[PDB]
Give the backbone structure.
Amino acid sequence: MIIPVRCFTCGKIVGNKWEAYLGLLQAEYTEGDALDALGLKRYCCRRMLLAHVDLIEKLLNYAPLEK
Amino acid sequence: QANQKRITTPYMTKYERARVLGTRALQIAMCAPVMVELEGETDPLLIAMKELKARKIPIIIRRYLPDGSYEDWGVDELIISD
Amino acid sequence: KHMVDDKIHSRARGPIQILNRQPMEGRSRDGGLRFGEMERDCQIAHGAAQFLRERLFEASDP
Amino acid sequence: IQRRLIKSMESVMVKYDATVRNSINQVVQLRYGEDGLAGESVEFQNLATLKPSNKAFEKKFRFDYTNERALRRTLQEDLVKDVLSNAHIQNELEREFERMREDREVLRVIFPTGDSKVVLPCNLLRMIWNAQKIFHINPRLPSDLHPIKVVE
Amino acid sequence: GEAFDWLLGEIESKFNQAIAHPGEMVGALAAQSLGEPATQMTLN
Amino acid sequence: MNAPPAFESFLLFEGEKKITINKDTKVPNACLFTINKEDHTLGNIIKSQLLKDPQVLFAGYKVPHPLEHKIIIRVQTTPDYSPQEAFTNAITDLISELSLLEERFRVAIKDKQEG
Amino acid sequence: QSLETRAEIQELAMVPRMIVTPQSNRPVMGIVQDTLTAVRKFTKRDVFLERGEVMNLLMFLSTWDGKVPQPAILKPRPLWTGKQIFSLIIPGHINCIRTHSTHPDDEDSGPYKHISPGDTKVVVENGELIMGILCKKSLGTSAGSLVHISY
Amino acid sequence: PYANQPTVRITELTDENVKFIIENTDLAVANSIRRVFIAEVPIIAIDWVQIDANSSVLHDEFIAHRLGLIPLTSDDIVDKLQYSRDCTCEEFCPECSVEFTLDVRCNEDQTRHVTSRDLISNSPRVIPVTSRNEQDDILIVKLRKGQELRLRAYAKKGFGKEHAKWNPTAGVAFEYDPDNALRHTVYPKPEEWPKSEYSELDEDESQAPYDPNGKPERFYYNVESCGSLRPETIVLSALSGLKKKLSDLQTQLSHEIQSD
Amino acid sequence: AGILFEDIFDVKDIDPEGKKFDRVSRLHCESESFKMDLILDVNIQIYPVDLGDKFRLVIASTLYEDGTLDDGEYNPTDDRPSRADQFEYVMYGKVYRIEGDETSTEAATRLSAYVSYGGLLMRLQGDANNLHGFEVDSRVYLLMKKLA
Amino acid sequence: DNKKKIIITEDGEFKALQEWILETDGVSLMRVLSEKDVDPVRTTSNDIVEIFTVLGIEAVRKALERELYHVISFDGSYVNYRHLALLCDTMTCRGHLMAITRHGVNRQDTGPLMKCSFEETVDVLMEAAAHGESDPMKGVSENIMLGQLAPAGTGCFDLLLDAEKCK
Ligand SMILES: [Zn+2]
Ligand SMILES: [Zn+2]
């Protein structure tokens, strides 16, 4: 639902790159160039950022249980 | 039936070996005397197999014939293959 | 969905059915596994008469 | 089909008189498989006297006790002398070949098609090979086995 | 001679080992031997 | 349900020996070292160091089961030598090699950060 | 749940007693996927093992007498062959002739019948794989294979 | 019959990775060093969580697992701290553990990013790597107005054999014989394969001529750090840990030999 | 001495049927002193052999210069004088077949000894006078050296 | 060669003569056999019922063995002949073609309890009640139902203690 912390394969930290990745994408980067800007050179970490679906943004459309 | 002429095989069948070993292992487990010497064996199955190899199991196999008669073979009288 | 932890099951003298005093059916009922007709036939072919009697008489409903 | 077959044959069993009988004690086979042998121990082999011609059968199975030098190559000196001199031994070997020829005709009426593949208990060629390797048989030297010992 | 005698003994022992054992449920065994291959051969 | 704790690969159970030496009776001057709670990391280096000893005739190791957490190292030496002595010397040589490698890596790091 | 039933199963239904089936007088279990592809690759003629590799493999023989066999190649560098190690795996002194699946049918007629160019024509003698590439035909569930002859 | 005399040559040293070469060592030593980089170099990581309040959309174990994988600077503290197995204290103490606290509440209308910057420690030396004084902070959870996350974590000493969260590496590139001279690989079509970065071959040549007398030497390493330890600290700690494994093994060996 | 056969061979062909294995090559060679054909499987990866080469082949029952049997076990820590020191390529195998042109009545004029060096096969065929040292299921060594 | 005419030449070799053979789509074995220039010795059929009606019980035994072998081996498989022989003897040991069905298996004198195990449980037990049939408990099904040791394998004999050998 949320960006993983580490790459499943190598263990590189990708948790701090989702927001930067999105900011680069709205900056008219291609996904490949964006992944290059964040330093994801192994295709495992590129897999992590490139195949992520941010479902938490949809789960935050529901009001919480307590106000 | 004449015990002087027993028509059944002189070999112990695989089923006879199985049941004789199981029976004797249960007897050993129920504190029956052992017929062979023992180094350190405490498993009744191992003791029963040692007794069978030594030909010292005190059991008689009563093999029934289709006609109704039977033949009594001592476990020491049969040929143990396996 | 098929995780092993939802499938692993074992029994040793658990509950029994009311009508025939045999082990229950299912993991959820802590039931026993069925020793069916084909298993009976296999053990008949094996010649294992005491094991067959244990499974079909002594481990089910003496 | 499996269940039907099982329920039809379930109680057929080999009895201690070696007959195969059902629960009613009726006789289904006087010996299991017509030969009283279990199916685990048998294996595929070849009948060597089924397919060959009469000339080839003669040449391969008729012990030739007239060729002195061939016997000298196959057998040791005392065996060669006994085989060439004795006539009782020669008659024994002749009847051995006649018995094999009768066996040949029996096989020819058993297997009307020339199929020598048979399923039999003991793999005799493999046992012969085992004996050759266990005793370090030299195939190039004359043997110390008397053919009369083989027949007997 | 030694090899032939050993061969004779080996043939005798293996033949006596190939003999069917009284108590073999050859009928159930044959039903299984004929029904197991039936599960592979084609329906059509 | 059946998951062993992850520390069981590294930690010795109470009353369990780190290493056990058993004489191999098949051939002379051979021993089996059953080392508990180790894996290929030490087995491979110990084996390969033992192979550098000309007085070692056999040096091998195995992890008998990956789910279990022991290794067995079989060492056979020449009659004038001992498998226990060979194993000891192999460990000593590995320790000296690693000490030298560590000191040289420290020197290389110092050179790289300095210039 | 009893010593009698335990003895029954141990003497009748144990898996080693179940290797050869009475249905078709052949093995019912044989060597299977990875072990079969790998034994085919292993018994090829150009498989040469080094001393450390050979010791690694001998660690996994339960029925090993502890004697390293003399390598098939002594110089310029000691090398064992895959057949030389499978010979250690093969039990007893069994004798077996088979043919690899790629055995050409016109090779047993011409020359080179007993020295096969393709390393087909499996020959095991005295429990040593004298020659040939092992495969389904030699280690599978067919009749007359090494596993059958071993049993 | 004696040890190798390995040499070292570091070809790149940054804060993110160390690229070096070990020569004149055995392949088993090189691979055990490589394995220790991953599995026996201790670091500090969160291994105990107590959720006092979690109104977020991720359940408690999700947050706990996520906190465990945040790297914590472990450089000089990991050698000093003890394993809780070895500590003579109760469940916790400052000698075997580091306390973290996290307390965030989304009161504003925009989504609140609970990141690793919100993990407040009692020890200034052991902090989240991203929080160390660029790269953004690791995201623990996004919160909506009215959602709240309050927890108390404890970080422990461990290595990658127990859990990958105690693995300090973000990839260990290991290579040897870049030109296939030992023929430990057999390319069906050697021309089809790209050249290693460490290759020394002219472009017409696909692989080096076969070396019958060759042995694996000159192993190339690129140890990338997840952040907890410096890459050179990972390598030094790996060598020290492997040496102490061997020393303990030799101690137990001596006890077994003398007891016989 | 322990030498069953010795001669100088000349590589007349390499892999007539084509390369079957990558690291192994079959040489069809003929000598000059005895007129014996040779088929030999060699690991060309470690001991490359080119067409037209000329080598000395020595089938021996033992490696020790003095008559002394071998145990068939690998003993690298052996300091005795071994004749493998005088050769480049050495293999160790066993004779698994001896054919001939013998008849039911005549002995063999030509023999054909087959040896297997752990799967690398050799056939040495020629006059039966030069192959009396060969006996089936007997261990031998190759002892082969290249010469100019 | 399975349909060719295999003869033995005067030299003693097996020779496969390539001859014309006819395959019909129906069966009148009774009539076709009695036709001029038709071989009344090798002409056969795959309809085992007609073989039984025309040639008899041993002829249908052999033919049924042949047809089952053809069904089993057509896919290259192989089954030990003793299993086919036992199945074929079961279907022909009572002088008629005993189908492996309720109409052949529950029509023999196997005992009501063995029959109820297979099929027609209620009809079989009701017939046995109406006729006072007695099951001698000889088969394995009957003993299995009563929880007794089946006379099968390990149950086909008895064990006795040897008093003279316990010494
Ligand atoms: Zn990655
Ligand atoms: Zn503490």
